[PDB]
Structures are given as structure tokens and as C-alpha cells.
Amino acid sequence: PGSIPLIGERFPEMEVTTDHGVIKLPDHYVSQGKWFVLFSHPADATPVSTTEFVSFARRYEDFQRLGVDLIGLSVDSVFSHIKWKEWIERHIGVRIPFPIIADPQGTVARRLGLLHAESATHTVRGVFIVDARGVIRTMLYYPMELGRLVDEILRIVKALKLGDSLKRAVPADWPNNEIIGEGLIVPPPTTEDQARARMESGQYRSLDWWFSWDTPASRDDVEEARRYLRRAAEKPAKLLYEEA
Amino acid sequence: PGSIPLIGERFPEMEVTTDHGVIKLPDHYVSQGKWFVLFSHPADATPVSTTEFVSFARRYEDFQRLGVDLIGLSVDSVFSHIKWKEWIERHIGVRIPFPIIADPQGTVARRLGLLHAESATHTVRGVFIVDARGVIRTMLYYPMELGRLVDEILRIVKALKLGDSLKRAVPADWPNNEIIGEGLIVPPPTTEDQARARMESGQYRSLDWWFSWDTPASRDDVEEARRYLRRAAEKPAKLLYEEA
Amino acid sequence: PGSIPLIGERFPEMEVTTDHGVIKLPDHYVSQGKWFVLFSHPADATPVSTTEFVSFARRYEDFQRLGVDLIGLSVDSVFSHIKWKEWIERHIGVRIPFPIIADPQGTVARRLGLLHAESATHTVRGVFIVDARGVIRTMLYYPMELGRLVDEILRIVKALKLGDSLKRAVPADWPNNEIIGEGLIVPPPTTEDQARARMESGQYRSLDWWFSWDTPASRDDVEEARRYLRRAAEKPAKLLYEEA
Amino acid sequence: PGSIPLIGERFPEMEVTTDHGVIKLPDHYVSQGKWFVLFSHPADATPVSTTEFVSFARRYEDFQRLGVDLIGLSVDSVFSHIKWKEWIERHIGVRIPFPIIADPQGTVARRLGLLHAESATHTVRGVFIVDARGVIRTMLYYPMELGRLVDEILRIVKALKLGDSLKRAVPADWPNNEIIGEGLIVPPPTTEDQARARMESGQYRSLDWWFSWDTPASRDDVEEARRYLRRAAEKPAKLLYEEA
Amino acid sequence: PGSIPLIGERFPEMEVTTDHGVIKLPDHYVSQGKWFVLFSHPADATPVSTTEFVSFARRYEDFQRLGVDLIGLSVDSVFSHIKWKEWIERHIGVRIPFPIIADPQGTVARRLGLLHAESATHTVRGVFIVDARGVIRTMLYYPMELGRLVDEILRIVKALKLGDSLKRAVPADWPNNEIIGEGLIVPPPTTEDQARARMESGQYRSLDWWFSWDTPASRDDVEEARRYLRRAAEKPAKLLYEEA
Amino acid sequence: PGSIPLIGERFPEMEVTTDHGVIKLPDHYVSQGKWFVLFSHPADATPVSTTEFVSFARRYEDFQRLGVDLIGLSVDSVFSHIKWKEWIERHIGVRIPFPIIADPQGTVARRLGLLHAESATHTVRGVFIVDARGVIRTMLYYPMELGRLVDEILRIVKALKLGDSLKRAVPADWPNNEIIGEGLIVPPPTTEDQARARMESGQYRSLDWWFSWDTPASRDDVEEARRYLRRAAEKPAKLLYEEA
Amino acid sequence: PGSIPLIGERFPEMEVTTDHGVIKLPDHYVSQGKWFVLFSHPADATPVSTTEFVSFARRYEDFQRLGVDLIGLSVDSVFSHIKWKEWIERHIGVRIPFPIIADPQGTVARRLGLLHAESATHTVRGVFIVDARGVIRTMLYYPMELGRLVDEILRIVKALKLGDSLKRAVPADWPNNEIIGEGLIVPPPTTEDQARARMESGQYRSLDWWFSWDTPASRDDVEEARRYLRRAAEKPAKLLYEEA
Amino acid sequence: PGSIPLIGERFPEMEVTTDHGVIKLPDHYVSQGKWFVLFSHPADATPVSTTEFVSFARRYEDFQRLGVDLIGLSVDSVFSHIKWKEWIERHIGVRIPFPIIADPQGTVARRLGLLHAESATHTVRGVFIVDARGVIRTMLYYPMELGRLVDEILRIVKALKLGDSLKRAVPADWPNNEIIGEGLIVPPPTTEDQARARMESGQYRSLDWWFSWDTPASRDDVEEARRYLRRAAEKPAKLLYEEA
């Protein structure tokens, strides 16, 4: 087993070296009121890791529309990071606009619990979704052999921001939930008096005193979230390897 | 600030009580040749949790066809589990066929690192994807306020089984990767002699000695994985609340 | 083999979540000049536990006339508590007016020594009788298989309050003690001078210098206590299972 | 706080000195197939303690009908025990047939957790109800100022033995429970299959799948238990202080 | 300060990953009867490190003629090592024939004491000269800002092999020592009888009983060592950047 | 298996006894704006050590021209040091002008890590090159059986001083580097922005964005460094053992 | 304070390097059936130390006649020992026939408690007198500033050997004791019966039962001891500086 | 085994009981500007011990003239000390003028390391020579079976006082040294400059730069020291056992 930071904790205070410079996390993004997704990959100049960097780069403007910055992490040097980004731009025609943390002694990897039993030396494919107060909101741990689904990361941020802005919880598979569709959920009553008030009010659609919802998301918010999943589900019009 | 099991580790040996009886993990599934997805929810009779149980139940046959069983977990009693599954069948018209672990002292939750800072008393929405050798392959940690995307859990299992079987790694967003599409990746050479043997062979499509791929997945395997993503992306034709 | 609070100790300071909201013990009750009976049960929606909550609810007004508040406790959630109280009101026709502590990780159970060897996960049927100074006065530990006799909890509180106000000890089986009946005991002399002064004053009925009593309790106080024991002894006129 | 033995644990293995000789607990009783009630009192030749010894003695034949032996305990000498029993026989006309443990250094008191905060030097009024396998079934802790209700001890043993014999749980205030009267409870189902088998059965009276009961106790078993409570509730015909 | 292996100790036993595969040190070389020079550098694709790799490669056959193998070490991945060697072959026209250890978590660097104060993350320019018994013979620690003099490493190994074979010590600046030129030193007497015997022998040229020397090195051995220093001292006629 | 001071650390604060008196290191030299080379030898009146002292003394003016003081060290007494320097002057005709630390209990030797496994009693042939800020810049560890190449110690100091004043790194075998000759290296860019600026400035000759150099050293500085190596490579004109 | 070996303990087992070769103490002398005097001095080539070595060498035949070997000790090297013995032979015309331990890390000195507060680095002038069983018989600690009286070391050994061989204790200032002259002492009785038997026997001259003596030493033994003290007391006829 | 005070340490601070009263060491003597010789003996009324007390008493005026006080020590009581001193005066006719420490629990013995392996219970014959600053100057450990040579203790103190006052060291066997006679030694130079100055002055008779002496002790001071040794060497005129 291994120690990790937890959902609802402030992201561990640390200075990190990137291919853009030295920064403090989460302060660098908090002090900008920006969410960030910190993700890790095992090594530069590996193929699954390259596909994921191109996937994130292709979605960079979608992340910017949500006010989310991206930051990568591997045990490779800053020199490896610059050479690999140059390789991606020259061979795939895709610019990588976001920084990568260089973590050669595993100081950062050990602090974030990113060294699992699959490799003694290379981080797994971890994802830390961190809000503008620097709070960890979600964490994903994919293995070496499996690329992430980057549109799910966009859906998670979009849904968490919608939840925060509307005081709602977000049903499974939102905005295509099989029970309530694009509905959002009202946090259940936690007292007898709240439960009776909920039942006596006709404000919401309800299945029971503990299961109320409404549709307070804009059509734009719902369709933007659905577009992430539609993109995930679509066969590419043209494969980048062909025009490489 | 919390301990977790790690990717590549055997799932921790434990006896657990479910609403189906007492079993040993991971032995109960390993003995059946099954993968399992263990997932947790904060409390029975909460709405986002209810939507996730219904999503998993709707996908249960898709899990069974992959050789995957499901097992839930919360801090509630077995009596609470029986009452809640009865509620879902009566009010939503959906039978929950899979067991739920009852963990009222958090023994299991503390062993799997499922108590995060968001709640002192209720587990987060954790997911442990465990193979038929009992080895942890992937872990996800969703928060209280946000439902999972259950079609991503099917894509992860499908992709892992295909990668294990075909001795391949799986690109970002497979089977719709923007560079190689439904292509699967050949693990990169790790020596000078292997890198040369690779460059010399012409056996595979390559962008470089470290980036080779081919298309060994069957049309049925690719179509199956695309069907999970298309289901995630499509607005349901009928919402279950409307006949409830 | 487990730690408990002791008679004569202050009830442990703790914040607890109930189905009425968050309260501080024992302060919430000390502040109001009220005694409280904290009692635990293994799990909501279990049948002996249901019988006990109905027995307490039937006796609620008897407790209130003594200045005694009631508070329950189990490892179940607040959602379980609200659903179970609804079940009792709808099926038995009896409202449970008093709060139940929700203790899902067993934090309170462990502090109060309520996890015994009969169950790893569910509290025994514990009773803490706590006076208006927050001091533990009496503790009972009933097992899973045996419901309490709630009239004895009333008899304990009534007798303790009488003993405190009248500066007396209470005989076995009061107010029907086979030696002195409704008599209340003068604490024995603890010195030679006190013993001689007791034997020489002739203030009290005596069997010896160490065994003196009088009858200072009111006819109302004595009738109040006998009514609890008569109710315990008589077959109820009609069983609530009928009108279901 | 203080350490106690727990419900469901074997009674702690110990050699004790009594006014009858040296015995091993719980072995002495286990080997005769007897239950025992071990109770404690603060000091010989104190008045509440004397009332309780007389109450137990008066009920001695009732304990023998249940196959239950009585054993007392205090920090006093064997010599004190013999003198006090002589005093009770000579002044009250009641013989104490059962042994008392002499525990002058508090060795047994510390093992059993009977030193609470009310007295550094004398045991509280503890009660341990111990079955014929040597297992602790119930524990009561009464204070210095309050005598016990000995008829409730009889009702506890009678109810526990009936529960064991008929494989039933015992409702609140049995055999005068307000819901089900003298009915006994079928332990609730703990699995979905058991819950369905129960509800398909029509074998038992039920309020829900988790609340089933029948009336398997003999009329003799019910009326014997009601008799204990009627005696508790009766004004004594003659007070023993009159016959001095 | 920091811990290092010491002259006269066996090279610490370790399995290491190189761009040629996994080997055990020092066993991999001992089993071949080969000396090895293990040298570190801070990072792949850094300019001083590149000049050092080309300098070692240019001297590869001089090392091979002495029975000395070369092995590099940095915190970079095997992928970086393969790419960097490819760059050197393509841009400088010099193949790097010898393996490089990949040490991404600094496991080897910490064991060898190669993390100094100039960098928390990158090894200094350490050199371990290890004989065919696996014993450390000499250690050099150059900083990030200064490239090594690779001909001094050849002079060291040549001189140590001569001293071992001829049972001689090697004067300062050999083979151009200012007192004795290419002379080798007879280890000094360590007893009174040895001192007198030496002085009575006329066997060696002597400055005193403790300072004796002869000229047992071959003309070829002396000429080879003088060739290493002449190479160090001469300005290359053609610079490799011109042919690049 | 031994602690050493590290490159980039201040030289450890210590009072040392020499044959010139007590001095504080590194303060004695820092106060003078002087570098020092502290070097050790196993024992006075041993032949390799004598050749090394003569080599340093012959090069004393070269050290003085670089602003470098010399200080020796062995476990011998100050009396032994005085007698041995007199032996060198009388028999070889060379005055040793610099002090030797007397370290009979290995107090200094243990602080600098100069006791290795080759001798429990005598220091190895360690070299600490310390700048005028008292910072350790290079460390060499030569064994008992092999004399140092003193011209390499001059080349290190000269190159380090040139690197410090010109803000440059020094290639392998400078000033005879086979790629860039007497070229000095511009520290590589550590950011993407820095890399692009470098590649677009045309300010330096470059092999890639990470490998730029120029020729900022004076002809004098280059020839002075080359002279040290020419002297190392020259067959001595006449051996001092003849003149002895 | 500091730890020392003790009188009546076996001389600590140790391998030591001398200017005669490596020996085991005390085995080297035990196995020859010889006593040894191990003595220490601060530093070779110091003037008091030189006077003491000449004094021991003068008395060497006196020690050999007693069966006593001599061994010196200082923190100087074997090379220092050899050069210093040559200096004494050349300048004073006295060969030092006996070995000197070389102890440069003070390993031997620490074991024998020879490093006192007067010098952190040099031994005091210690003397261990060790018999043919390897047992320590007497220990002397002289300081740096004060040469020993070597004739008192001869007197100690002669008198210990006489005590051992005649089973006698030796009076103050033997053989010139003011009370009994060359008389030797019978150990005193230790029991009442021995005291009475000693006083009744007329066997010995006595002052009291605890003070008996006789004259068992030979004229030759007494003369040998008197000659040591006469030599100590004699103003030298010739001084060796005059022909040195 | 065994801890002792060391040469150049302050005599340990202690309060001691003597047959003259309680005194503080070393303060009692430091206050008066006196040296002291603390010496120990195994037991009062033992014969060797008695001869030594008589020898010290004979030399008492010689010790007084040097400003040296005498203090004895054994594990015997003050009562034994008084009786033994009376025995010596009555039977030998010699008054013991100096105090003896009574150390019955071995508190002082243990602090001074005077319990050796020859006896668990009785101190050896230790001697601490302590100067008027309270500093330990010399330590002697003689065994049970061997009386001290008290004239050597006088010679030590006289030579130490001369060394201190004349800033000289004292040669072996002073004042009858075979090299320099009554000469005293100039401490050797410890620097090159001091060694040169010494050689260049012609101030002192010298054998080498490290061996210089002169004759600064007075005629009276030399004759006093020679008298001690003449007395040690003199066959007694008459024996005190005879005239007694």
C-alpha cells in the first residue's frame, strides 16, 4: 500500500520545477483563481503517454473555456520534456502548450502517491482535479498499459463547476442520466424537520423525500457536457498518423 | 494523508459481509475466474448513489459478458442494503442483482482508503478494478457531489482485457484515438539492440523506434467498446422517472 | 476487554450528529438543567430495537415530567434514522419524538465502550443515565437478543432524583422493599462519634447503628414510582400489531 | 474510563476466595451446567447492600428453578462475610444461602471493572449474568445510592434462556410488550434470498420482512416472567422490620 | 555530508537497468575478469555530459585494450539514453558503444553517494574505478560545471594494473615523475630486519631505506601511458563540430 | 560505508594543528580571498607521498599565480612533518613551503571521510579543492599505491576560475576538447521560452538548443591551462635522483 | 574519566603492529612463558621519550635476566619508529633492541586508557606490568612532562616474582624496609582459627597475629634489587651527551 | 573494565569523611595552595599497608617541605583508622600525622576506579598526585602483594614542581639521567619557524632541533631529589621491629 492526498484536502504545498520555470503548487493556480488538472505519465518518449499529451493538447481550448490549466508530471528531466514536446510538434504537428513537472528523484511522485507496484521507477497515470481554492476534488489512477479518456476529465470539471454554482449534486452519466436525464439533484434532507419541509413543498420533482431534482443547468452547459462525450464516441474524421 | 492499496498489488485479503452473505475478497471472484469492480457510495437512500446503482444494473449484462462481477460498499447495514434495493425495484422498476458490502465500523473503508476529507463518516465514490488474478488494475476516486460515468468503467475493463490478451498498450481515448484510431500500441523497445531490431523489421506502422502500433483488435471488440461510448454520449430515449 | 465511562465520571465531551441536527453532549442537556438517558441499539429496522423505541415513545411524557430527555444511538446514517421513524409512525402509529445519534464509523460507540464481542459492527443495547450536572449515574448493557425493561429506567431516574433531593440512599426494589417498603435509607455513620450520636438521637427507625431509615418521599413520589412497576407488570389492554 | 469484560466474552478465568471456600470461575458453574449471577456490593454491614442480599435470598428458589447460582462480591474479608450473614439471619430472620467473594486487595474488582469514580475503595453494584458455557450475557452497573430491582435480573435470565431454547429474540418489556405482548421475535433476514423466503412463507405474523414473530413460549414460561414483575410492583403484605 | 562507498571495499552489490538490459554489479564484470569505470553525469542531452561521452567513446579501444569496460549512470530513463546516444551518433558521428544505467528514482545515486549540494535531483560527475575482483580502487567527484580529463582515468587504470602485476607503487605524475621518471617504487620496509636487508641488498636504486625503485614497466606500457598524456596535452587538428 | 563532505557544501569548520601552527579552516583562506587545495597522504617518510610533495612544491608558483594555497594532512605528528620536510630539502633539494596538518587520532581524517577500507590507520590520498567562499568544488580519492597527477589539480582550479568569471561550463579535456577545442559551454536553457530564444538569437555556435558554446577565454588563459597538460606529458629533462 | 584495564584482569586480547612485525598480546609473551612491560610515550623524536628509551635499553639485560620482555607504544607510524631508533643508535650510540607498537588511530591507546586530558592526540607515559599468565600486575600513568624511574619498574617485577615464588607479600621500600629490612611478609590470617594457630606456632617473627614475616629471599635476590636502587641513586660518572 | 579519573582532569569534587573530620576534595587543599597525594590501601591492620603508612610518616616532613599534604583511603571505618593509628604509635613508635578517608560503601573507591579484579571488596594501592590547582598530575596502581616505593612519589612531586616553575620537562631517572644528568629539557619546537630559531640561537646545549636542555634547577633542589633516591637505596642502619 501507499499514502495519497485525499478529496477535500488542500493540494500538498510544494515547489516544483517545470519546463516553464519553478512554481509553487497549488499557490500558482489558486493565486490566479484557476482550477488545475495535474496528471502524471510514466516517461517521456513513450507511445501511450504521447497519445495522451496530444489528446489533452487537442482539448486545450475546452479546458481554457472552463478556466482550467493543465500541468503534467514525470520523473524525466526538463531537457527530456523540451525534446519530447519538440518531437510531438515536429512529427504529429501538435503544439503542447502546458508545462510538465520534472521529478527525477520522485520527490513529487512520493508526495502524491504516484509510485504503485507496477513500476518502482515511473509514476502511474494519476490525475488530480484541483479547484480554485486549491482543494482536491477528484483523483483517478490509470495504469501504464491504458490511456485515459480525456473527455471524462472535461465532463468531471464541467459537472463539479455546475454543482458548485447551482448547489446541486450530479447524477450518474450526467447529462444522459437514465432516471432524470440532464436533471440535477437537490442534496437530501439530513433532519426530520428538513424531510417534512421537503415533502410539504411542491418546489421540486421527487421520487421520495431524499430524492428531489430540477433542471437548473443552461441548455449551453448541458450541450457542452454532451459534446465532450459525443467527441469521445466519434470515430476520427482523419488520423494524425496519416498527415504526419 | 491516507493509505491506499496500489495498482499492481493483490487486492487486500479480507472477509466482508454483504446482503448476499459472507465472502472472502479477492478469493470469491478469483475462484470463479472473474474480474470484479468494487465500488463504494456514501450512504444508502441518497440520490446520486441511487442513480449509480441503476446505471450499474442497466450495464450488468455488459459486465457479465466481459467476465466482470460488481460489488458495492457503504457504511450502512445489510438491513439498509435490502430496504434500499427493494425501494429501487419498486419505485424505478430496476432490480439490483449484485451484492453490497455492509461496513458500519469502516473496517473495509479504512483498509481501502475510502474515507477522504470530504466526510468523516461516509466513504467517497471509490472504484477498484480487479482482475481474475486478484490484482488491482485501476482505481478511481469520485467525490460525494458527482456521479460516475459507468461506460468508462466498461471501456477500462474491455481495453485492459484486450491489452493483456494481445500484449499491447492502449492509446488515449481508444478506440477513437486521434493519432492511430482503433490501433493498439506495441510496448517500446528498452535496449539499443531491441530499438534497432524494431527499426529494421518493418513489422509495424511506426512514428519512431519507440512508437509502433498495429490493429489486432477484432471488429466486434472495437464495435463493443464504441457502443459503451455511444451509450454515454446519447440522451436516453425514455427517462425512468416518467413511468415511476 | 473493552474501556467504558464509569459511574461518577462526567459524560465524555463530544459533538454528535442526530436526525435533529448537531449537538454537544453532555452540554446540550446540562444547559437546560435536564437529565438525559442516552441509549443505543444495534441497527435501525430491526425488530427488538423497534419494540424498544415504541416503549420509550409510550413513556416519553413520563420522562418529560421527570425533566429527563431521551437520545438514541446506532451506527446507522441519519437517512436510516429518518426512514425508520417514518416506518414506525406509518406502521405502528407511534411518533418517535426524540433524536437518534448517527455514528457510522463507530466513533461514539468506541468512546462509550458499546462494541462488545457479540457484534464487531453493531452497538449492544447500552443505557447511560446522566444527571443535570453531566455526571454518569447508572449504566446498563443489554445484549442483541433481549429488549430492555423501560419502566426500570424510569424507576432508576425517579429514585436517584429522590435520593439526591432528600439526601437518602434507596433500598432494593424501592418503593416495595420487603424490609422497609417505601422507606429511604440514611447513609450509615462512618465514625465512632457519628455511630454513637446516631444510636443516641432516636431521630430514625433503626435495625442497628448502620441501618437507619425514614419515609420522607411524598405519597405522589411513591405512587409515581409504583405506577411504573404496575405498568411493567400488566398485560397491555390492546396490542398495537392489531391496528396495522 | 475503566476496562470491563464484554457481552459475548467468556467470563475471565480466575480463582476466588469465598465464605464457602476457593472456587474457579466460571469453571465451578460451567461444570455443573449452571448459569450464575455474579453481583458486587460496596461493603458488608451497609443498609442498601443488606436490603439487596435479603431481596436475592427471598428469590433464591426462583433462581434455582432457572438453574441459576448466585455469587456476591465485595472488598471485605471472609470474616466480615460470615459475621454479616449471621447478622442478617439473626436480625432479619433471612438466611443467605449463596457464597460471597472476599476481594480485599481489589484484585477481582479491577479484573471486572467494578471500581468506578464514586469510590476509590469499594465496588459499585455490578451485575454479571453468565450462561452455562461461561459467557457473559448482560451486565448492569448500579451506583452506591440505589439498590437493584432483583425481579428484573430474574426476568433477564428467564428471557435469555427462552430466547436460547426457542431461537428467538425478546421484545421490549416482555412478556407485556405493547406491540406483540408475549410474542417472541424471529431474528431478521440478513440476505436478499432470506428476506424473500421469509415474505413468501406466511409461516409467521409479520409487520415487514424484518419484523416477524410467533408465540412459542409456554403459558407457564409467560406467567412465571409476569409473576416476577407483579412481585416487583406489589406493596409488601408485611414489612420484615416489623418482625424484629 | 553524505555516505560513499570507500576505496578497498567491494562495489556495493546491486541489480541495475541499462540501455543494454539488466545487470548485476560488480558481478557482471568480475565474471569476465574485467575492470570497470562506472561514471555518472547529471542529465542526458546536456552539453558538458555530451563532450564527456564522446571523449570516453573516442578512448573506448584504449579502455578495451586494458581490459576495462565503461558504464555510465544518470537519473534519466532508458528511453532518454537511447535517444541521446542516437543524437550523438547522428550529430557528432561518434557511436557510444557502452551502456548507461537508468536511475530515475535515484536508488543507485543514493547508494553511491552521487547526490551532492550543487543539485538535489541530478548526480555529480562521479567516477568509480573498480578492479576485476570488484574492489573500488579510486573515486573522483567532478562538479556540474567542469568536464573530466578522461586521459587521467586511463592513466589511473593503466598505473593500478602495472602496480598490481609488478607488486610496485606508482610515483606522482608517472610515467613522467620528476625524481624517478618512469621508475616504479618498491613498497617500503615495515620492520627493522626488512630495513637492514634492503640497505644491505644493493638490489634497488635507493634514496634511503624507505625509498627504493626500479624500472620494471615495459617500453610498451610506458609509451602507452605517455600517449594518453600527450593526447590530453595536444590541441586536436580537427574539431568534431566542423564535421557535424 | 563512509561519510564525506559534498561538492557545493562549505568546507566543515575546524581548528587544525599544522607544522606552521594552529589554523581555522576554511576561514584562514577565505579571509585572504584565497582558494585552497587540502590533500592527504598516508604517512610521512614514504616514497609515493615524497614524490607527491616534490610535485606540489615544484608547481608552487603555478598555484600562487592562481591564488591557491596548499595544505597537506596525515596522521603523523608535527615532529614527523618537520623531520620529513628537512629530509626532502636536504636529499632532493626541494623546499616544501606549505603546511601539513598533524592528525594523530584521525579526528580531521574522520570528518573529511579520508579513512577508507584499504587502511584502518592511514588516510587515503584525498584532494579537496575549495574556492575563496570556502565551498568544496571538487574531491578526488586516490589510493595508497598510486600517486596523483598534480597538473590535473592545476587544470581543475584554472578551469573552475574561468567558468566562474566567464559564466560558462567547461567541456571534457578542456582546452583540447575534441568537439569544440578551447570552446566554453553556455549553460543549457531550462525552459521552452529560453530554448526558442537561444535557437533564434544566432549569438552562439550551436549543435542544438541545449549545446551552445563560444571562445571567451583569453589566448593566455587557454595556453596556461594547456601548459599544465604539456608538462604532465613531457619526459623529464633530468631526473632529480641524479642531482640528489 | 576514561576506562582502563584493571589489576588481576587478563591483558586485553589484541593484534598490534610493531617495528618487528605483527604480534598478538598477551599470547606472544605467554606462549614464551615471559613477563612483559608494555610502556607508552607521546611521540617519537621527543626528548624525554628519547631519554626513557635509552634508560630501558641500558636496563635491557637486567629485564632479560628476570625473564621480562619490553614493548613500547605510541601513535607514530612504524616508519617513525624505525627512523627514531636509527637516530638513537647514530647520535647516542645505543641500539634499542625491543619493539614499539605503531598505533596511529589510537585504537590500542583507547583500549588501554592511555589518552588522558593532558593531550587529545598523544598517549601519556603508561606502564603495564604483565606476568607469564598474561595477567596485569601493576599499572603506572606518568605524564608528558615527567620521565619514568625505570629502576622502580625493575624493582616492581623482581619483587612481584619473589612474592609469587615465595608466597609472600612485599613491604614498603623493599629490600630496604625500615621495619623488617629485606624481610618478606606472610599474608595475614582471615579467620579466628587461623589467627589463633598463627599466634601459637612460634613459626614466624610477628608484631601481632596479622603482622608476621621471615627472610626467605636469597642474598643474590636481595643484592639484585638493591643494585637497581643504587644505580637509580648514583650521579653518573660520564654523561652520554659529551661523546654524542 | 574500570573507569578512572585522568591526568590533566580536575580531581572529582567530593565530600569525604576522614579520622580528622569531613572535608571537600580537592577544595580543602586548593584553598591552602597545597598539592596532595591521595593514596589507598586495602584494609587497616594489614602488614604491607602498615609498612607503607610508616614509610609515608617517615617522609612526612619531606612531603611538607614540598607543600604536599598526604591523605589515605580504605573501605574501613573511622573507628578502625583511629585504632590502627594507635596500634602503629604504640607498637612501632611512629605517629601517623595525616588523615585517612573512611569509605565503607566504596563510594570514593568507585569514583576513583580503585576496585580492581584482585579484590571485589578492598581498594588496590592507588596513588593520585594532585597539584595546588586540583589537577591530577600522575596516577600509580600498585597491587595488594606489593608495597610502594615512597621515595619515587617524593621524586615525582619534586620533579613536577621544578618542571612547572622552570617551564621544563624532566628526563628519565632525573636527577641521574645517563644523557644529561641533572639537566632539564626544553619542550621541543612544534613549528618550522620555532625549529629554525632554536637551531639558530645557540641558547641551549642540543642533540637536535627537538632535543635541547640546560641546568636551571638549584644545587639545593638537585641535592634534595638525590637524597630521596640515596635513602631508597640505603640498607637500613637499624630495623624498627628490633627497637620495639
Curated annotation (Swiss-Prot), chains A, B, C, D, E, F, G, H:
Induction annotation: Up-regulated by hydrogen peroxide (at protein level).
Disulphides: S206-S212
Alphabetical list of CDD domains matching this protein: PRX_1cys
Record's keyword annotation contains Transcription: no
Function of the molecule: Thiol-specific peroxidase that catalyzes the reduction of hydrogen peroxide and organic hydroperoxides to water and alcohols, respectively. Plays a role in cell protection against oxidative stress by detoxifying peroxides.
Family to which the UniProt record says this protein belongs: Belongs to the peroxiredoxin family. Prx6 subfamily.
Protein's name according to its UniProt entry: Peroxiredoxin
